Structure formats: structure tokens, C-alpha cells
Amino acid sequence: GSHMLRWKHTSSLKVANEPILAFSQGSPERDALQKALKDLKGQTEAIPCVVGDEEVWTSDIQYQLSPFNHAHKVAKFCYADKALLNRAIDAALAARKEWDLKPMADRAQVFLKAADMLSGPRRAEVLAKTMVGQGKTVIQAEIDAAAELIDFFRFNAKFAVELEGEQPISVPPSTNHTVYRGLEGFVAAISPFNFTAIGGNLAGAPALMGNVVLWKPSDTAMLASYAVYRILREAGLPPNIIQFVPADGPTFGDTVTSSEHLCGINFTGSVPTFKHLWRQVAQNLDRFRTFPRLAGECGGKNFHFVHSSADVDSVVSGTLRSAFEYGGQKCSACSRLYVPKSLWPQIKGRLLEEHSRIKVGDPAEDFGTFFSAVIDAKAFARIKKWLEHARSSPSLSILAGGQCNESVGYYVEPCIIESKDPQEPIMKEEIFGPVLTVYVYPDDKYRETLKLVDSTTSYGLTGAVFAQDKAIVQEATRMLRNAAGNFYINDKSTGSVVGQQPFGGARASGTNDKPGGPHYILRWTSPQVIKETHKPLGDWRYSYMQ
Template sequence: MVLPFKHEPFTDFNDEVNKKEFEAALNKVKGELGQEYPIVINGEKIFTDDKLTSYNPGNKDEVVGKVSKATKEHIEQAMESAKEAFKTWSTWSPKERADILFRAAAKIRRRKHEFSAWLAYDAGKPWNQADGDTAEGIDFLEYYARQMIELGEGKELNHRVNEHNAYTYQAMGPGVVIPPWNFAFAIVAGTTVAPIVAGNTVLMKPSENTPVIAYKLVEVLEEAGLPKGVLNFVPGDPAEIGDYLVDHIDTHFINFTGSRATGTRIYERAAKVHEGQQQLKTVVAEMGGKDTIIVDKEADLDLAAQSIVDSAFGFSGQKCSACSRAIVHKDVYDEVLEKSIELTKELTVGNPAEENVYMGAVVNRKQFDKIKDYIEVGKQEGELAYGGKTDDSKGFFVYPTIFKDMDPEGRIMQEEIFGPVVGFAKANDFDELLEIANNTEYGLTGAVISDNREHLNRARTEFQVGNLYFNRGCTAAIVGYQPFGGFKMSGTDSKAGGPDYLHHFLNAKTVTEAF
């Protein structure tokens, strides 16, 4: 019997025992920094001279690890491996495949702090954020395993006299997984194991920023008994192998999370049918957001401020769900702004590999420079209300920044910054609050802080986002509780961690037998 899904609990780091255990995990990982990691094709570990080097964002000279880079030749080898492994893996029962995920989840759970410590180094994640990332990865393994067992039963159809009809699901074939760096364990795990438990084989190209923690997932899946060739680990330069993976005639699906620019490029390229290709490619794309928290005049203003600050500055705003826009009713605008500034002043910034802080550094030099440029834009478009400080002397630190009196059509309020920057704008009434909230090309997450039930009911249908929250922040979706994904230019609304997600990696099949 498979127990019902229950999400992995978060660690309370106010507990001294938990704190000491996490510090021990950080020390353990520190002793393993600087190692070299291979490509993995058909279970074979391949080391190359050309490598990706991962650095600690909070200590930019500290090497986390060096990971071998795959070439197009390696991609061909990996695809052949995936095609061969598919022949047998696709014949395993859903329960047998799910058991691999259950075993992997148990192994990760026993080493939870260790995986989170790797996130503190590889991605610069603060303790709470790293713990949540690891917990979400466990949740994906547990949830998708259960979903596949259920789908393995097929769906009930009607029958006629002397005729039996069956509706079942079967795997597609080899596919490509391209996860991001910001949820360097959770999304890597979710996007990888979903197609695998559905019976497909995978070529996984991790982000070049966080390849070490991605390799740790490959290791644990192998330890859990995943057969050779089912998961092929092919880190590399996106410019060299990205298009090649997408264009390959044997690629059946592309599961991507990342920027709008890359996502739309993948969507376009995947639509082309190449000579020798025998299937249309499925694209699952989550491409970012420009997320808004609305504050109504009838609202808990302390809750509003806390929701804005947590959603804007958690993991330095490096979430596609992060609140980068606070649209506040004019009657409470000044009070919500002031309360948000006061809360922001309490936030701590530092290196999570060394101390338990609220915010760490942003992931790399490119992001640091980009966010720094946006802060200068913000000074031209509105008024800097708090923060604006940056420091790259040791790591890539951008301090929490609040702009006020912003033009809703300005760049700060329209473009995805992916950093700890939030802009405030005021609205005259609820109509205008909704109008501004919907004025971007994105449609990922949003929140409404209001005690007005009529307004909440309107927002339920009129606020154009895939994940809408009432009287809480707009981040922190839980697997199985808030299936995640948006529409418009936020992606294909695939709803990761939801009951429909595995359908993207399965072909539905009807079989009719006459008697």
C-alpha cells in the first residue's frame, strides 16, 4: 500500500540542535570542495579537460567544484544510450519505477542537511531557503511517484455489447531536461524525475552556474537503483550544446525552466520538424514572471508589509515568483511603504556558508551587474526609498532595495530583474489595482491583501496569473498543495507539483477489443 502524499517538513533553525547539525553539514561539505565531477552517459563516468567551474557566490574565489563539459559528440552518445535504455525502462511497471523515486527520496531525507549545505555553497542559498529547496526536491520525488502509480491504472471508459475499451498511458521516448540555477536541487529533481517515472529516458543539462548539486541528484538516483542510460548527465556550454539538444530528431520532449528569451527560443526551435524526425516535440516551459502583490484599502497592513518583504527579498529575489511590484491603494500607500521599509531594515545579509543570514549573494557577476544597472534605472524612474547598496569585494552582494512612486509602465515595473528590488506604485481604486497588476506580459504569480470579499472574488477570475494567493505572499508554492506554473509569457502553465504534470510526458492510448 502506498501512503498518501505528505509534504516534507521544514527545519526550525531556531532549535539549537538543528543549528548545530546544519553547521556540521556545512563543515562536511567544505571538506569536499574543489573536487572534479564527470559527465555520466549510460552509467559511465567521463572526465574531460574542458570544465565548468562553480564558485560560491558569497565568496567568489572559493571553488565549489569543477564539472566536465559535454560536447556534441557526447550528446550523440547520450542519446543513443537513452534510446537503448528506453526499450527496457518503458516496460517497467509504474510501481517499479515509482519505487526508485521512493528509495531516492528516503536517501535524500537522511542526508537532508548535507544537500542543503551544498546549496549554500553552490547556489548561495541561506539556510531556510536551502532547506526548503531540498524539501521540495523530496516532495517532487514522493508526489510524482504516487501520481504515476495512479496513472498506471488508466482511466475508465464506457463499453458496448461485445466491445471492451481501455484508456492507458505510455512513455514517449528520450527527452531533454534543462533546469535553472535558482532552485538548483528542487527544480532539477522535479523536472528530471517526472519524465523518468513516466517511463521516459532523459538527457539532463544542468545550469552552468550550479552543476555540482545537480550531479548529487544523479548520484543518489543511481544509488537508488536507476538503470544505466535512463538518466544521462550532460553539463556544458549552452551555446555549444543547447540548440543541438533541442533540435535532435530523437528528442521527444524538452522540459525547460529559465528565462523568457531562452524559453521562447526553445519553443520556436522545437516546432520545426527535421528530416528523419518521427514525432512532434512537446515543450514544457516555465519562463519567469513580473509578480505583483495588490494591497487593498481594506486590509491587514502589517500582513501586507510582511508579505511584500518576504516575497521580494527571499533568496535575494532570485525566484520567478518573487514580488517585484507592490501596487497599493492610495489611502494606505504611505503606511504600507513605511512598514515595508522598517521590516527590510531588519534583514541580514551575508555568506550562508558561514552564517545563518536572511539573504546571501546573487548568483554571479552577470546577475550582479544586471541588477546594479536596474537600480540605476530605478533612480531615474522613481525615488529610491531604501537600500540600493551593492558590494562585490568578496561576493556578489546586492542589498534589499525599495523604490517608491514608480510609473507602472516603466522598466522597473515591467522587466524581470531577478534580484532584491521591489517597486511601489499607488492606485486610486480596486479597478486600477487590477489593471496595473495585469499590465505586464507575464502571468505567473500574484497576491491580493484584502478584507473585501467582493474584491477577492473579482480577483479570482480577473487577476491573470497561474498562481494567485489571497492574504499571503506570492512565493513558496508547495508540491501537491499549490501546483505551480503560469501563462502569458510566463510559460505553458504546466503546473509542476500538480495532478496533470505527468501527462506532459505520456502518450494517451485507447485500445478497443471486439468479442
């Protein structure tokens, strides 16, 4: 009755959130970051595609510009052509079986080592590249390229190693065991400009689970994304496990959805693009060896709802941060504020006062900067068009800000707008800029207004309620159950922390796979169950048949 398959005990991992640094004057991290910023001034990095260990250049040359000084080309890179993408697929597939068979703990080690590199010796580098290339301030780069990315790597490693301990029941005469296989084929990872960490997670989490990946990073985050890629390779990621393949979006999607070996798309970006990819997979369903798994996070139109019992100062500070940090370029950013008439004079006064103190400028040169330029010319143009809409629309009034200037960087001042119409298009459409719209509701219609918060937009990502009345908090929490996948009581709608607020929402906001939580990795494994029976089978007949 000897067991021919032997299963080894699996270990556990102790991890904690990466501490956020203060960057106080005289601190080593402030000095190190200033040096790293200086190291990037006037520099352009030539960033190749990487397939296996080969640096590959195509003729389709592209540039990443510094958002706050667009004369500065921070990187020159190139778009992979269809030939290179297909070569990358073939090479990844040829490397997959060995990587998938590697113990989970050994794959995890790569990510734990990368996390330690990011935490210590490479922190200043990835922060500086995120600041200069994506226009983040010190603290926005810190929470993203350091803390969040590090946390994704450590927490997903923990969740993955511990997943192997989730095993079925065995009853004599048999032993049952679940093998957490990677997906058979390759995964396409498509990451956004606004968080360096998201690129690391979109490519990294599937790789952790035994997959091979073609990673198309965001053009406007290339410098920091490549830094992360190199760190993973230095941390021991073998060749052909993650292919670094910047590419034209449509071209990339066409190529990966045309491969019989596509097994997943891990996407963060626009609703229309996610839908397009979903439709391409559906169109090509007959060619795939298996059913591809699509994961998408697709944005929001997020709210701060204020009840008359709210702490005014908390509303003001939390809303200013949520609406304007990183120029409002977060899928979680507050863009609609609902205020009761009774509190509006106080809140309006405070918002306008604090608004006048917000500094917009160069985040590398002036650490006094609250936020800097938006990401690129396309974003600038879109935001400018909304500001013009606000000026023309009778129902919209600009209370503060409204200016923009793209002569040196893509600079947009923080803008506060009041709408008399809770259904105005500006209350519905995601702007991805520093543009806050306020709707003032009569206190006596708070319940009807909560229904409007829930029904006005197509999105379901984040939202906050500010209130100190328990009954109201309970009621609002029930009414807004599906209006936000990340819901906040007396805190701002942005700044989810890995392991604390797993992030994601439904409605138009995506598939809600909750990166940052313990279940996200399950999308990237296809379990097999093995039953070994240790005694001979008896007769095919059953006793009741006699």
C-alpha cells in the same frame, strides 16, 4: 472467449507533504547541517559528465563559485561536447524500451526510495550543497532541496501509479485497456539555478513515466544537482535512463533539436531561450520521428496588490519575504507593490523600519542572515544596472538600499524603489534581484489600477491581493483571473507547496503544465488503447442492407 491479455489490478499510494524542519539550537538537523557545511568549506568537487555508468571528462572545464565567497570554487565540471551528447542519446535510446516496459510501480519505487534518502540521511548534504553552491539560507535550502524535491518525487509517484487506474469502459464482446506508454525517443531536461528541486523534477518526472532523459543541469547549481543525480542512481535508477550532461546552452539545444529521436524538451529558464528552442524544433520538424512536446516555465513580473482594507502587518511581512528571500531570485518573487494612498504612510514607515533590520551576509557562517549574495557576476551586473537606472530616472526614487559590492561575494542590499509611473520599464522587466518597486495609487482609482496590474506586464505567473473586504476580493479575483496562474489572497506570492499550490502560469510565463499538480505527468506519456475482442466477427454486411 478466454482473455489473452490479462490486466493486473493497480495499487494506490499514500503520501503526505514532507515536514519542514525548524533547525532550532541543539536540534539534530541543525547539528547535521553545520557539519555538512563544514565538510564543504575549502572543498572543490570534480564533477564529471555521466553517460550510463561512465564518468566522462572533456577539455571544456568549467567552475561553480560560491556566490557569497566567489574565491571558493565549489565544483569543477565540464561541458559535454556534441560527440558526447550524441553518444548519450544513442545509449539512452538503447535503454528506453526495457525501462518503458517496467511496471509503473517499479519505476515509482526508485523515486520513493530517493525521497526517503533525501528526507533522512542525505538531507544535510543536499541542503549544505544548495547553501554553499547557490547561496541559499538554511530555510530556503530546506524548502527547496529537501521539502519541494522530496514532495515532487512522492507526489508524482502517487499521481503516476494512480493514473494507471484511469481506464476506459468495456462492453461485450470486448475488453479495453489504456497503456500509459512513455514517449518514443528521448527527452531533454534543462534546469535553472534557483531551485535544486526543479532540476530533480524536470529530469525525474519524465523518467518516472518511462522516458529516457538527457539532463543539462544549471552551471550555477552543479554541486547540488550532481548530489541529486547520485542519489537517484543509488536509489536504483538504471544506467542510461538519466544522462548527467552539463553543457553549453546553445550547444546542448543545437544537438538535441538536431536528433530525429527528440520527443520532448522539459525547460525552465528564460523566455528567449524557450522561444529559440521552440523555433529550432519547428525548423527541424521534418526530421523528427514524432512531434516533440515542449514544456516551459519562463518567469514573471509578479505583484502584491494592496486594498485599503488590508492588514498592514501582513502586507509588510509577506512583501518583505516575497521580494527579498533568496535575493528575489524566484520566478514567483514580488517585484511590484501597489499601495493605496490612504495606507502608504503606514506601510512605508513599517517597510523602512523592517528593511533596516534585514541582515545580508554569509548564510553558512551566520544563520542570522535573511538572504545572501545573488548567484553570479552576470546577475550582479544586471542588477547594478537597474539600481543605476533608478538613480538616473526622474520617475524613480530609491527609498531604501541601493548599495552593492562584489569584492567578496555578489552582494546586493535589498532595495525599495518608488515609481511615480506605473508603466516605467522597472515595473515591466524581470530583474531577478532584491529590487522591489512600489506604485502608490489614489484610493478612488482602485478599479483602474487593477486593470493596470493586469495589463502592465507580459507575464502571468504569480500575484497576491491583500484585502479584508469580501466584495473587493471577489472583484479583484475576477479582474486578475489571467494575471496570475498562482493567485494569493492575504498571503505572499512565493512559496508554492507541491500538492497544495501546483505551480505555473500563462501569458509569457510559459506553457502552464502545473508541476506540483496531478496533471503534469500527462505531458510525458503517450497513451495507447488496446481493445481485445473475445468473439468471432460476423458478416461484413449489416442487417439494414437486406
